[PDB]
Ligand binder design. Structure first.
Ligand SMILES: [Cl-]
Ligand SMILES: [Cl-]
Lengths: 292, 292
């Protein structure tokens, strides 16, 4: 059984005075649950994981696990570019009660495909918990080659790929090598979901679902029920275009804060949008909501 | 007024049974000093900094600082994609006696140009020690735009750039905006030094200088004296082509181990070359040394 199908949320971290705001975190998670999120991915890219302390990550994860209490899978981003540290974090996430972990490829150091196999298999072996691989070449400058995905999919605990390649030839090459019944493919790019779903993907791990979880999940459910969703996607597409103004999560946090979840604060080296851009983006959100 | 000119070494970390081998580290540093290295860059990309523990980094740095004892600048790689942690590491590097620190741009999270300014200035402000910026888009998928280099060069403690863009139009744009007397431009790609020196660069921070420091420094000194160094570079170019077989430092550690510094071991997620490739690269090194 897949961990989930449809829209998983790449959960943001709410800050107030550069401190994780647990009240806002809980309120945000409650909002996502109420609006049909299918999974919560915690301490990932959108959570600003590179700038969180270990104590913050563990606190956030435990808070989300306890609040969700089995309503949807809670998937802990634990992977870094250091295999040993990834092992430690993964084991601790399991101990806290995570349903799965997510492991990005290395970055900055990178590695070759043999190294990817050793890295991911070592962490999967240690944790003995479902593992979602995460491939995002735009951030890592490396990839999980389709042959490598095939090898990894045979590992008993490696069960899915968050595929942010935005490359549909890659998708087809992966599909011909894996079994979709036991190895899920989740888009890691909100922009491509219409085609990703049409081409047999299992869902998405989404940035924009932080603020429009209901509408974004409705897209998946609509196509699952046999609707065409090209027209339904259009206004979401317009909002995603507005969201492209800067590097995620700089823009999305303009919207989570707008909805009352934390202040509009990013931790260095990230920075907030300047006021004019913040206003335009919030107006785009308002326009989207008005148009429904 | 520059920390150094010519060849700085992007120092490797010698491992024996996955433990930093201090005896090999000291032997390697002594070899570099004996063979005209102009600076030693410690705990950078080539050192496998992403997989080293903080205790290991500090031990390595103190060991190098104490051994070198002011013979050449010891430049501590302390920058990460977390500004706060970069501040702590930089302050500690200063306390240990580093002459300068090196700060890569963020990666994985990345940031925008305003974020770069905040990130680098925050660390520079805290450490009050010469700072070498490090731009390597092939590992970070971001850059330090020429206008940003200009802004940063005005900071009293930001004194140089390790430029691994391999973009000579970029170099010319940077040169137009900075004062060469007070802001040094070091190549971060061994392959381009002939053109880099002739376009007015101050040197290189070098991977291949881990094993041929004397020959690589001789290029810089040769061109300094007014000689054209294109033909002199040719055999080094051939060795560099052999070194391109995999992602640094996977190949260079085949050669440092061959010279007796430490075993041929990389820490995960990196892996060693397979035996056939190890043999070919070592043969290329021997061919180069023969050929002198
Ligand atoms: Cl939030
Ligand atoms: Cl070494």
């Amino acid at each position: 059984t897949h961990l989930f199908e449809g829209v998983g949320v790449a959960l943001t971290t709410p800050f107030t005075n550069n401190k994780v705001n647990l009240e806002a975190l809980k309120a945000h998670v409650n909002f996502l649950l109420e609006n049909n999120a299918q999974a919560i991915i915690v301490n990932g890219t959108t959570a600003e994981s590179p700038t969180l302390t270990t104590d913050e990550k563990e606190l956030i994860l435990k808070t989300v696990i306890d609040l969700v209490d089995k309503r949807v899978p809670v998937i802990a981003g634990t992977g870094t570019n250091d295999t040993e540290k990834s092992i430690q974090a993964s084991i601790q996430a399991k101990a806290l009660g995570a349903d799965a972990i997510m492991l990005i490829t290395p970055y900055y150091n990178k590695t070759n495909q043999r190294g990817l196999v050793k890295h991911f298999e070592a962490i999967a072996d240690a944790v003995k918990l479902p593992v979602v691989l995460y491939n995002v070449p735009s951030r890592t400058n490396m990839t999980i080659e389709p042959e490598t995905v095939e090898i990894l999919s045979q590992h008993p605990y490696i069960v899915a790929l968050k595929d942010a390649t935005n490359d549909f030839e890659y998708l087809e090459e992966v599909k011909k090598r894996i079994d979709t019944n036991s190895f899920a493919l989740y888009s890691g790019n909100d922009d491509n979901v219409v085609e990703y779903y049409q081409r047999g993907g299992q869902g998405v791990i989404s940035v924009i679902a932080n603020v429009i979880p209901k509408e974004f999940q409705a897209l998946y459910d609509a196509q699952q029920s046999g609707l065409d969703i090209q027209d339904q996607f259009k206004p979401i597409g317009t909002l995603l275009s507005a969201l492209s103004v800067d590097i995620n999560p700089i823009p999305i946090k303009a919207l989570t804060s707008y909805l009352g979840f934390g202040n509009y604060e990013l931790r260095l080296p990230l920075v907030s949008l300047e006021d004019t851009d913040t206003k335009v983006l919030r107006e785009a959100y308002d326009t989207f909501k008005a148009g429904e």
